Design a protein around this nucleic acid. Structure first.
Ligand SMILES: [Mg+2]
Ligand SMILES: [Mg+2]
Ligand SMILES: [Mg+2]
Ligand SMILES: [Mg+2]
Ligand SMILES: [Mg+2]
Ligand SMILES: [Mg+2]
Ligand SMILES: [Mg+2]
Ligand SMILES: [Mg+2]
Ligand SMILES: [Mg+2]
Lengths: 72, 133, 132, 195, 128, 101, 37, 304, 520
RNA sequence: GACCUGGCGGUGCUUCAUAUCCCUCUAGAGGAGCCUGUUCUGUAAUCGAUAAACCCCGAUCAACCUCACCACCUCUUGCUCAGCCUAUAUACCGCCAUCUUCAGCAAACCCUGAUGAAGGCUACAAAGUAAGCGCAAGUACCCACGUAAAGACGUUAGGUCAAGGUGUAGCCCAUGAGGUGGCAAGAAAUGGGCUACAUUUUCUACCCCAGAAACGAUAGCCCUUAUGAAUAAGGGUCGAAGGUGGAUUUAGC
């Protein structure tokens, strides 16, 4: 059931461990809380691949970087 | 009278790495006809016998799902029509089965399916411990 | 009084075949299913797509072999390969028969991206079960 | 106008290669089949339908191919290719001794053009901790960490893996998880020493 | 839609309305009756709007001992075929609907002076 | 050539929901989260409010494919009860029996 | 998509291979209606 | 008519072909072999044998049809032919002849059986006439050929057993005799071991009855087998159960205890217990609920 | 490939050809519809994407000289190349790449006749940069599509400035020429090309016809091929076998080639030459002349693909069965009755004469019935042959029933076709034996059939014998009303009647005897 | 005027009534509240069935599509080689109620009645013979009983052009199509179901050996949570009507 659709040789740790993709925020803040839960849900989801996960992450990056007006 | 002289044989290569050891191949056939399931399992057990492996048989119970529909179109709530989907199970387990034997047997059976049947493989293989532990 | 997949009793001048003569509550008891797939079984899916595609198949083939068939079809889907079985009459030419066979097989294969095959059985006159 | 030749019934001999004339799965083809086998509800003072127009024989699944002779032929042919199981492996206890780590996957196969189905991804594995841990502190630690993945009646720790879509991703992630779990049960902390 | 379409006989039944209320009690109707027709028997399966020449069904496969090739019927030939098929359908309908002349016997709308021909032959064989 | 204009509208709604399914879920999570700022919640609320119509998967309906009947349709087979009974009587489908139990 | 289905079947009718009974009925009654006004 | 012989010879040829297929000497070959071969080579989920695929011999496929009863010209062969019912008429004639011969010297057969033995149908009235003529003949003495004529039609009584099966005793370690039995119920199934040498306490899934059934009617049902037989404190029993209902499990264990004790106790007491009626599985089960009904039997209120 | 039911069962070679050609035409129609409406099948419903099933795209893109040039070799035509040369020479005046010019020249030489003349005279405008590849491809084109003086001029020009290039040049030079052939071979072997022996194959093709003074040197040339050790001896060997063609069979060389092809069959084969299809056909053509059965068996893994065209398969099977018939014949008829459904007039004639020389009378009926079942109808050559051979016999008394049956079937076929006029002359030729067989149980049929024959005649001696035997086999009037009428018709029946009238005929009545006396 | 057939008889005699007629047995509806339909009131605000044989009916779903109503604003070959939930169920197909908790319906022959409509039965037998359908039998569940299933010819021009299609008649700048909104409340009557009106009751742990009380809100107000972009379950308060049923009526072996 997987002859083809190899996901470009992606890796289980590349899917699950988003610690390296999460670098541009501290460890305690509420944005860290939300993004930790996001990475949790993404690693829990097998249906979507590393590309989908990184586009989610970068869209969130753009979101709160444009909404950097508050940081409260 | 026409009997060929040289029967073309495939090419085979025994790679250096070892074959995998399957502990148990447990196949589960879902069907609609008990007679078709009996023929299929007889076929499978005869193939397993002729290949020289252990066997066992048992028949899990019949599962059925029914649901009620309106018999007529516009206004009739008391008069309904019913239907049922019947699935019949059959299990076949094979123990102490080599990887290449699994390959050839599953190729044979997977090409020799009938139509109205679903086939669920559960493969159990043992392996040694890792190196990092 | 229910009217469902049955023929009204006439004076006895209506040739009727087995499947359309027998009732739809004789399906598993005294008939077989026209199609055979596993989407109806538990655990599978795409059953709606299977139904839609086989209905379209039956319609298209009935209308691209019109006037020759005299009964419903037999569908046999073993994994990937699809198999069709038909009963037809022998009034037209084998030229046309083979041409339309190849045409329909190629079209079905190109549409469904699936290996398809179809067979046809000739009859001089459609077999009749009874006169109802 | 055109007339069809008579069937192959009288043409085919009693001595005949049925596996050769029916190598693969195919329809009934009563014209080729010499057997008068009929099937159908008989009418009062009547009989079932003749094999020719009996489309119900086609409706039902087909097994004229793959006779017992054909099965013997193909099995004694593929005997050359099948391999032998190690005779040293003769019992469950000895197989689990040789290779303690059990792992099993599964998947369905169904009729249709498509073949992918997410249930292909799930896998599970099992190992008895009676012989693997070789210590007591790490054993107590691990059994405290794991909540329900164990069972002491039969004494096997079992864990599943479905977080990844790929079977090999599930496999190697389970392996790495077991490795890191052993390495983290090896050590301890001060709040764990204080209980 | 195409999925909504279906075979002919049920459409013919629904259009003719042989039974359901009108036929019963003998009330009938006021001399309106829809005539049966078969469209599939009329035209050969080959022709259409785009007049591709089919060596398999439309054109004889071999000519001068040479395999044929798929070709295009020009629009003038297409119009000729359409015109002669219109003529053929009109001729068929003309032959279908015509007069009926049962010889006048004692009077019109009376079965008095009409003969049904001699009796039918017997089972054992007796020509009358 | 869909069955009718209501099927056309339903398919348009399905297209819009599919092609906006990502951002809708993203901002819905960003809204329903609680620890984040309430001002952020309100901004995301007004953003969802400004999102276009027919973009939600709530306005669509699991309608029939053949006759476009919204009611009496099975999610598995997707067919209306009437067409279901038609096919089950004509024996077109496979592996279904009358529950004479 | 009924788009693909019906477009294919219409183009194939124009080819002149699929004798569509329902369409023959429809356009025959259309001819009758346009003849009778 | 030649079609029959053509079918017979073609069936023999197809039988030889099928023997070659399945791989056996066509000399030795049987109808059960035909049945198994057709069942394996062409399975079918049809329930009725008449609908299932069958490869049968033509003599049994076709029913006997009355052959031509008159030559190519002139008279017919039989002498009641100008009327119907000729065979039964001649039968009544020679039967009455044998009757009057008897008087000067001085199980049954079904209507359809007689029909298909002959080549004509008949009525219940003249069937009763035939039966009363048979017993008229039989009430008096009967010769050898006459008894043979009667038993030609008379069939086997095929009497049933009317007996409760006896299970075999069993022996296990430390010289322990016992008997095992199994009982069932609506939804409860149990099995009990009865130890003869032992006596007193009773076990149920590893728990005593006093605390397994807080209610006393269940214990009364458990005692009813021992009470009728009158052996109360001379037999101990263990039992395992799987069921939903309390009274259901009670009845199941009662049936199991009785079915285990019937082995130990004499056949006379087995007959006494069968007369008591505690050695038969209850066939009664909750009826199905109907679609149009509010329940299994109750309908919606007639609204008028 | 053919269906299984008997009606669709193709029962003759021509109709089977037409049938699978109609199937191929349907395949081409499918290609046409898919490449005319790709968007319909554009959906990739199948999980594994397959370009074999994807619709096909021969659509030129927007005007883009560089991408258009890259797409030239993708579109595989000539109008695009003309337009691209136009756009590059007239207004641009630049070359995208020398490799692109080489590929354009390749395509135009492959596509090639005033059109070929124009295409060849429009290539000299190409930018000065014309390397070997360009020159030798121009030579290829001018050889395989036009005359040879142009190729020779181009080769001289190249010399002034490849394997199959020189192959085409040798073809051009050749197509008596002793010195030419010799110097060509010598300088070709002198050069360091080291051909793939396709040059040798082509020069053999050109030497298809010549006397011994080049047939025998071919043997030493082949020995040199073997010494260098390249050739599998697949096509040149067969071509020299054909060149052996012939006033007298050469048994010595025949045995030599038998051993050669015997070891060639013993070893396994691999295809290298496109001309291995004529191999089969012309090899069996030579085998038919040779006439040997061990030879046929020797000529008989996946080497059965080289038959290919139905015409070559037909020639092969025909000659094979002919040799097998003209070789007991029990094993031959066994092989035949085995291959008849798989296999497809002359063969049946040879079968009939083989059965005649064998004397196996009981077999011919089944063969005629099989031929009739397949395609034997509306032609009476084989009917005449079978009738003559079967009623030359009368030695089986019980088989006269089968005689009558096959005669009745033959007449049922004979009288089918009035409109064609061909059935009128069939009884005049073959009715005699048919009526004799009918006479040999039923007799009234033969009586009325001879009546119809004589009332259509061409009397015959065996016709007189038939009339005599029929008359002698009880009924004077019934015999007279035939023999006397045929006597009044013709003279030999009268000289026979002179004797027929002695037993009991003349005593009946004198009016017919008076007519006989008058006619005599 | 006399006859043939059927219906009807508050039409006679006999045999019956299986939960159906009753006498009988039980539990319910017609009592109060709530939920959900019907009639009716008003609204710009669908539609159809609307005795037996509808009233938790199309609907195994209407907060927005579902929407078919309506106000407002736009498109004119309009996804459709157009479209229309516009009328006609008194054109229909397709699908079902009804007697049916029936057992008869019947091609094709013969006969009687003076060759009329019509009838055709006497078994110790007098003109009826019967294809075929249905019933029945067998098949499904645990059996062979039982339950399901099945239940023809036909009545109610029975219901449904709104599952879908279709004949006829119309709109075809519209009576078609597209996007915002509300519409879907109750002075009232009626129907089906739920709750309790008690101590066989209420609460507590267990589902049955106990201890307390001498009950009742699924309505209302406030709040939380479920999904949604925008009714449901839970918590606090409110702690009544209600005291076991109007003729009459429903279901059950
Ligand atoms: Mg009903
Ligand atoms: Mg008049
Ligand atoms: Mg709505
Ligand atoms: Mg409208
Ligand atoms: Mg009505
Ligand atoms: Mg019944
Ligand atoms: Mg029912
Ligand atoms: Mg009405
Ligand atoms: Mg919400």
């Amino acid at each position: 059931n997987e002859a083809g659709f190899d996901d470009d040789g992606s890796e289980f740790h590349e899917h699950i461990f988003l610690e390296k993709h999460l670098e541009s925020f501290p460890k305690q803040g509420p944005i860290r809380h939300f993004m930790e839960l996001v990475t949790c849900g993404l690693s829990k989801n097998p249906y979507l691949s590393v590309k989908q996960k990184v586009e989610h992450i970068e869209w969130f990056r753009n979101y709160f970087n444009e909404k950097k007006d508050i940081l409260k | 009278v026409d009997v060929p002289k040289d029967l073309t044989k495939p090419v085979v290569t025994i790679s250096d790495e070892p074959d995998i050891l399957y502990k148990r191949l447990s196949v589960l056939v879902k069907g609609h006809d008990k007679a078709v399931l009996d023929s299929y399992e007889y076929f499978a057990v005869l193939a397993a016998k002729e290949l020289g492996i252990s066997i066992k048989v048992h028949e899990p119970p019949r599962k059925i799902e029914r649901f009620t529909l309106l018999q007529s179109v516009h206004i009739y709530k008391k008069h309904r029509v019913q239907y049922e989907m019947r699935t019949l199970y059959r299990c076949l387990e094979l123990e102490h089965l080599t990887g290449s034997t699994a390959d050839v047997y599953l190729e044979y059976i997977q090409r020799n399916l009938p139509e109205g049947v679903a086939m669920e493989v559960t493969k159990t293989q043992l392996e040694q411990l890792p190196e990092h532990i | 009084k229910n009217r469902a997949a049955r023929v009204r009793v006439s004076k006895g001048d209506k040739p009727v075949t087995y499947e359309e003569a027998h009732a739809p509550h004789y399906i598993a008891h005294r008939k077989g299913w026209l199609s055979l797939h596993t989407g109806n079984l538990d655990g599978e899916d795409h059953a709606a797509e299977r139904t839609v595609e086989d209905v379209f198949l039956r319609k298209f083939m009935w209308g691209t072999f019109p006037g020759c068939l005299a009964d419903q079809l037999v569908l046999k889907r073993r994994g990937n390969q699809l198999e069709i079985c038909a009963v037809v009459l022998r009034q037209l030419s084998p030229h046309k028969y083979y041409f339309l066979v190849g045409y329909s097989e190629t079209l079905l294969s190109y549409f469904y991206k699936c290996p398809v095959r179809l067979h046809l059985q000739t009859v001089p006159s459609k077999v009749v079960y009874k006169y109802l | 106008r055109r007339k069809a030749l008579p069937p192959r019934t009288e043409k085919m001999a009693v001595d005949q290669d049925w596996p050769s004339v029916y190598p693969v799965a195919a329809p009934f083809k009563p014209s080729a089949v010499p057997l008068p086998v009929r099937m159908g509800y008989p009418v009062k003072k009547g009989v079932p339908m003749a094999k020719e127009g009996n489309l119900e024989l086609l409706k039902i699944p087909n097994f004229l191919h793959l006779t017992p002779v054909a099965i013997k032929k193909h099995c004694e042919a593929l005997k050359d290719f099948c391999t032998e199981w190690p005779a040293a492996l003769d019992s469950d206890e000895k197989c689990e001794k040789h290779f303690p780590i059990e792992i099993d996957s599964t998947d369905y196969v169904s009729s249709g053009p498509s073949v992918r189905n997410p249930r292909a991804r799930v896998v599970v594995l099992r190992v008895k901790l009676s012989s693997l841990n070789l210590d007591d502190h790490a054993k107590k630690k691990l059994i405290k960490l794991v909540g329900e993945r164990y069972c002491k009646t039969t004494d096997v720790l079992t864990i599943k893996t479905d977080r990844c879509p790929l079977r090999r991703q599930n496999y190697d992630y389970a392996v790495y998880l077991l490795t890191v779990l052993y390495h983290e049960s090896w050590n301890t902390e001060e709040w764990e020493k204080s209980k | 839609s195409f999925f909504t379409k279906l075979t002919a006989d049920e459409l013919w039944k629904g259009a003719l309305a042989e039974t359901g209320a009108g036929a019963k009690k003998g009330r009938g109707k006021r001399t309106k009756k829809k005539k049966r027709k078969d469209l599939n028997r009329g035209q050969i399966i080959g022709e259409g709007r785009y007049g591709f020449l089919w060596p398999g069904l439309n054109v004889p496969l071999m000519k001068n001992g040479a395999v044929q090739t798929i070709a295009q019927r020009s629009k003038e030939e297409q119009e000729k075929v359409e015109a002669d098929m219109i003529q053929q359908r009109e001729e068929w309908d003309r032959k279908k609907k015509m007069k009926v002349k049962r010889e006048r016997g004692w009077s019109g709308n009376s079965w008095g002076g009409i003969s049904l021909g001699p009796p039918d032959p017997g089972p054992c064989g007796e020509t009358y | 050539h869909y069955v009718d204009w209501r099927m056309w509208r339903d398919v348009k709604r399905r297209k819009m929901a599919y092609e906006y399914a990502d951002e809708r879920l993203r901002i819905n999570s960003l809204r329903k989260n609680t620890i984040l700022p309430k001002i952020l919640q309100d901004v995301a609320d007004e953003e969802i409010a400004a999102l276009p119509r027919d973009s939600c998967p709530v306005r669509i309906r699991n309608r029939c494919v053949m006759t476009s009947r919204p009611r009496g349709v099975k999610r598995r087979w997707r067919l209306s009860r009437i067409v279901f009974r038609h096919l089950a009587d004509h024996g077109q489908l496979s592996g279904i029996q009358r529950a004479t139990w | 998509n009924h788009h693909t289905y019906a477009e294919l079947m219409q183009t194939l009718r124009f080819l002149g291979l699929y004798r569509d009974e329902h369409q023959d009925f429809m356009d025959e009654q259309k001819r009758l209606k346009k003849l009778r006004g | 008519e030649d079609f029959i012989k053509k079918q017979i010879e073609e069936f023999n040829i197809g039988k030889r072909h099928l023997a070659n297929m399945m791989g056996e000497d066509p000399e030795t070959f049987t109808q059960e072999d035909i049945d198994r071969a057709i069942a394996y080579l062409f399975p079918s989920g049809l329930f009725e044998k008449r609908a299932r695929p069958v490869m049968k011999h033509p003599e049994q496929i076709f029913p006997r049809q009355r052959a031509i009863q008159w030559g190519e010209d002139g008279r017919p062969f039989h002498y009641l032919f100008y009327t119907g019912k000729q065979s039964y008429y001649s039968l009544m004639h020679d039967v009455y002849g044998m009757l009057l011969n008897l008087e000067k010297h001085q199980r049954w057969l079904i209507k359809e059986e007689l029909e298909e033995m002959l080549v004509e149908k008949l009525s219940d009235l003249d069937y009763m006439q035939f039966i009363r003529l048979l017993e008229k003949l039989l009430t008096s003495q009967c010769g050898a050929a006459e008894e043979e004529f009667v038993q030609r039609f008379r069939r086997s009584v095929t009497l049933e057993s009317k007996k409760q099966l006896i299970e075999p005793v069993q022996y296990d370690e430390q010289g322990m005799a016992f008997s095992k039995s199994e009982g069932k119920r609506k939804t409860a199934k149990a099995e009990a071991i009865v130890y003869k040498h032992g006596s007193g306490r009773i076990k149920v899934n590893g728990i005593d009855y006093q605390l397994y059934f807080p209610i006393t009617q269940d214990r009364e049902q458990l005692m009813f087998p021992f009470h009728f037989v009158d052996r109360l404190g001379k037999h101990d029993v263990t039992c395992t159960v799987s069921g939903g209902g309390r009274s259901a499990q009670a009845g199941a264990i009662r049936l199991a205890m009785a079915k285990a004790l019937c082995s130990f106790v004499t056949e006379d007491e087995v007959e006494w217990m069968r007369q008591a009626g505690l050695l038969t599985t209850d066939p009664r089960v909750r009826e199905r609920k109907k679609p149009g009904q509010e329940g299994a039997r109750r309908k919606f209120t007639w609204k008028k | 490939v053919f269906q299984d039911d008997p009606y669709l069962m193709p029962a003759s070679s021509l109709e089977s050809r037409s049938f699978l050609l109609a199937k191929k035409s349907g395949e081409n129609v499918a290609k046409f519809i898919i490449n005319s409406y790709p968007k319909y099948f554009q959906k990739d419903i199948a999980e594994p994407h397959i370009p074999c099933l994807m619709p096909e795209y021969f659509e030129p893109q927007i005007k883009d000289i560089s991408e258009a040039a890259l797409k030239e070799r993708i579109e595989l035509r000539k109008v695009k190349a003309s337009v691209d040369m136009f756009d590059q020479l007239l207004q641009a005046g630049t070359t995208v790449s020398l490799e692109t010019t080489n590929s354009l020249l390749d395509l135009l030489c492959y596509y090639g006749t005033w059109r070929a003349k124009n295409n060849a005279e429009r290539i000299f405008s190409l930018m000065p940069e014309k390397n070997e590849h360009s020159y030798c491809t121009m030579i290829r084109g001018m050889v395989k599509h036009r005359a040879y003086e142009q190729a020779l001029n181009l080769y001289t020009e190249l010399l002034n400035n490849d394997v199959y290039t020189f192959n085409a040049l040798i073809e051009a030079t050749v197509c008596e020429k002793w010195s030419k052939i010799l110097e060509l071979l010598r300088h070709m072997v002198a050069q360091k090309v080291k051909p793939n022996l396709q040059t040798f194959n082509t020069i053999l093709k050109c030497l298809r016809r010549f006397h011994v003074f080049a047939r025998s040197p071919a043997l030493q040339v082949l020995r040199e091929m073997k010494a260098i050790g390249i050739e599998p001896s697949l096509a040149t060997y067969h071509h020299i076998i054909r060149l052996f063609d012939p006033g007298d069979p050469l048994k010595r060389s025949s045995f030599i080639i038998y051993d050669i092809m015997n070891e060639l069959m013993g070893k396994r084969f691999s295809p290298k030459d496109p001309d291995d299809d004529k191999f089969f056909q012309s090899a069996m053509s030579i085998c038919s002349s040779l006439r040997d059965l061990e030879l046929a068996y020797q000529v008989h893994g996946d080497n059965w693909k080289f038959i290919g065209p139905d015409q070559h398969r037909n020639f092969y099977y025909s000659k094979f069965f002919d040799l097998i018939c003209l070789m007991q014949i029990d094993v031959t008829l066994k092989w035949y009755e085995d291959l008849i459904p798989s296999a497809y007039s002359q063969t049946m004639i040879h079968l009939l004469q083989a059965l005649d020389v064998a004397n196996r009378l009981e077999v011919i009926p089944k063969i005629w019935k099989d031929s009739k079942e397949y395609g034997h109808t509306f032609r009476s050559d084989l009917r005449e042959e079978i009738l003559m051979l079967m009623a030359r016999d009368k030695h089986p008394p019980e088989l006269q029933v089968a005689f009558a049956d096959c005669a009745a079937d033959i007449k049922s076929a004979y009288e089918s076709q009035p409109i064609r006029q061909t059935a009128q002359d069939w009884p005049a030729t073959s009715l005699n034996c048919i009526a004799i067989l009918f006479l040999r149980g039923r007799t009234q049929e033969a009586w009325k059939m001879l009546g119809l024959f004589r009332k259509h005649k061409i009397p015959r001696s065996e016709l007189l014998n038939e009339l005599m035997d029929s008359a002698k086999v009880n009924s004077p009037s019934q015999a007279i009303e035939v023999v006397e009428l045929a006597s009044a018709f013709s003279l030999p029946i009268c000289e026979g009647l002179t004797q027929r009238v002695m037993s009991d005929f003349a005593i009946n009545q004198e009016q017919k005897e008076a007519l006989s006396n008058l006619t005599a």
